[PDB]
Amino acid sequence: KDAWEIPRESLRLEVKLGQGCFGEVWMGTWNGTTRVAIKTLKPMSPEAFLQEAQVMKKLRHEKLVQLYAVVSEEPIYIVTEYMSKGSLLDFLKGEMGKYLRLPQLVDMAAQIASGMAYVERMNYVHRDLRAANILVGENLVCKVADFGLARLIEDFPIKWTAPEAALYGRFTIKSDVWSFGILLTELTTKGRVPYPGMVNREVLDQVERGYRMPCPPECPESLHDLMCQCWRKDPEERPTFEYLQAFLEDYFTSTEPQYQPGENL
Numbered sequence: 098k099d100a101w102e103i104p105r106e107s108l109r110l111e112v113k114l115g116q117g118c119f120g121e122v123w124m125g126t127w128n129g130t131t132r133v134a135i136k137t138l139k140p141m142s143p144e145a146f147l148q149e150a151q152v153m154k155k156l157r158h159e160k161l162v163q164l165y166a167v168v169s170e171e172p173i174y175i176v177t178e179y180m181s182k183g184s185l186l187d188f189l190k191g192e193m194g195k196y197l198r199l200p201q202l203v204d205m206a207a208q209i210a211s212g213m214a215y216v217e218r219m220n221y222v223h224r225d226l227r228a229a230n231i232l233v234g235e236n237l238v239c240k241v242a243d244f245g246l247a248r249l250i251e252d253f254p255i256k257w258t259a260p261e262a263a264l265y266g267r268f269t270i271k272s273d274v275w276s277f278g279i280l281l282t283e284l285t286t287k288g289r290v291p292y293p294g295m296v297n298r299e300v301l302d303q304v305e306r307g308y309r310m311p312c313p314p315e316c317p318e319s320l321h322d323l324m325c326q327c328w329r330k331d332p333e334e335r336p337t338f339e340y341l342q343a344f345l346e347d348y349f350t351s352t353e354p355q356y357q358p359g360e361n362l
């Protein structure tokens with residue numbers, strides 16, 4: 098069959114970590130040694146499910162969650178590297194939140210940008226970029242997840258969605274850039290919901306009129322400016338992820354060489 102295929106007895110499902118309507122997510126072990134994450138399809142979605150993990154077989158990048166193995170006959174199991182810290186959202190909101198300062202948060206943003214730069218140059222579109230869908234491991238490693246497979250399973254995050262995508266279905270790498278700007282506010286507020294106190298309908302009406310979130314407290318204006326570039330009305334005017342990565346990687350030398358730590362950032 099396939100070199101990614103593994104026998105069912107090589108997988109040991111240990112701790113259940115997530116529940117869905119179409120399947121489950123587990124932590125476990127592969128070949129008795131390798132710590133892994135496991136998704137199951139409930140025999141729910143068609144056998145088009147495997148067309149998505151075929152993408153995961155094609156895509157390979159240090160900042161994308163790495164496919165390890167598949168069980169492609171029903172009931173299907175998908176195995177990837179294990180991200181010990183869960184979602185970025187949970188990480189930012191939990192015990193680690195209060196310790197993270199701008200240097201850590203901007204480095205995490207740089208990693209996410211690097212993953213998204215790979216997506217960009219491969220001509221993919223994520224469609225649901227936000228902190229809930231980023232995974233965190235040891236040493237503050239951050240990775241983009243199974244965006245294609247997650248998109249298939251998901252068939253409303255309009256606070257993270259560019260107006261042209263939310264209104265006219267134009268989902269592009271550029272609407273992903275918009276989402277990345279929103280993700281930057283998640284980082285700098287340590288996981289707070291964007292547009293605080295606004296309902297979905299308010300957000301749509303306001304963003305249309307040109308409203309953009311203001312500079313978060315203690316966030317340098319230069320980083321809020323970067324967010325504003327990501328939130329440009331014209332998608333083609335928004336920066337590339339290649340530009341975002343470079344800007345974020347060089348931030349504390351080229352952009353804020355006089356940064357001083359504060360109470361929260």
Ligand SMILES: Cl[C@@H](Cn1ncc2c(Nc3ccccc3)nc(SCCN3CCOCC3)nc21)c1ccccc1
Nearest residue numbers: 114115122134135136175177178179180181182183243
């Ligand atoms: Cl399971 C692990 C996070 N993680 N690591 C890999 C991985 C992973 N890799 C993968 C595996 C098969 C097919 C596609 C992708 N997928 C996921 S999706 C689970 C997200 N879920 C985590 C629990 O809370 C609700 C949201 N989460 C993952 C985790 C560790 C500690 C706490 C919570 C989750």
